[PDB]
Amino acid sequence: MNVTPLDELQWKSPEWIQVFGLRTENVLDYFAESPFFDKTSNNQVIKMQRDPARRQILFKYPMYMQLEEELMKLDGTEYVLSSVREPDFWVIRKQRRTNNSGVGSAKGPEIIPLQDYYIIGANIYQSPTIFKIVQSRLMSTSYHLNSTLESLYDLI
Template identity: 30%
Template sequence: MAATAPVMEDMTGTMWRDPNWLAAFPLNDLSVLDYFALSPFYDKSCNNEELRRRGEGIERLAALPPGIEFKLQDAQPPHLFVIRKVLRKSPQSEENVAFYYILDGSIYQAPTLHATLSAKMKKCLHNVRAGFSKMQQDLDPLHKVVRAGASAKEEKARVAAALQPPKEPYSREHIMNVDNIILTVLQKDQQRQAPQALEQASVSHSSSRQ
């Protein structure tokens, strides 16, 4: 019966290190798997553990039956090591189960490609929603213009009609209607800012006289 890959526990939020071990032993290509075997990421049912019990070296992995194995994938001692967890199905066939990296003695589980892409997609979706929200806020004053003597319901219908793209090319009347709405908004904004500007000028003039 062919071996099947175990269900992986997501431990990407876990970091592990042993300062006492690091103070006593150098971290290099020969010792890194022994250090990794102390961490919660290690699977004690793996073939590496069987070799440790026998007192045999890592080069004897191929002589064991198929199963879970940990292999040093890449190393830039003493700072960075990449360890691969694989399911060996036969001498010629193996399946990657997980990757781990050791950075300056701290061990982490590397996120899967699916998790990485999902995180980036969520970030993109957040930015798109934030952009639409900002655009809605910028256009909101156009929907708050109310003509003198007109009800809010009538004004809302007028603004919606003015901003609705016509089926035919824009007529002169449609363009003037939109221009009038925008001009009204700008005028209201200027009237609201005028008292503030006058107050600031008065304060500045009083300060200069003193």
């Protein structure tokens, strides 16, 4: 039993036939990543059953913009001049590729932050990573290799 854990591959060619070309892309990701767990899909199934500061920075163009309204509706803790979301998954993109996050937004007149996971998506692959996790990486690697070097100082 071996895990792929801290993001690895895609799901590829299988919704390449179903076709990836933005907007549909997000749903293709859902099958692929094995990472739609609650809200976005839940919204999907219920129907299937029968701005923000970052959003202002983002600005949504086409049908995914319509979905966005739906998602807010699904997940909005409400305060006087503010709304906060539970488990929505969403995206930011360009041309060949994009990046998407699954997040929680806290709002106010002069500031608003979404805490989430962010995932980049190029050519049927997802990236989800952490600095500090990122460092431990080639850092411990550098040192194990330096200690190979130090072990080689077994020279007279």
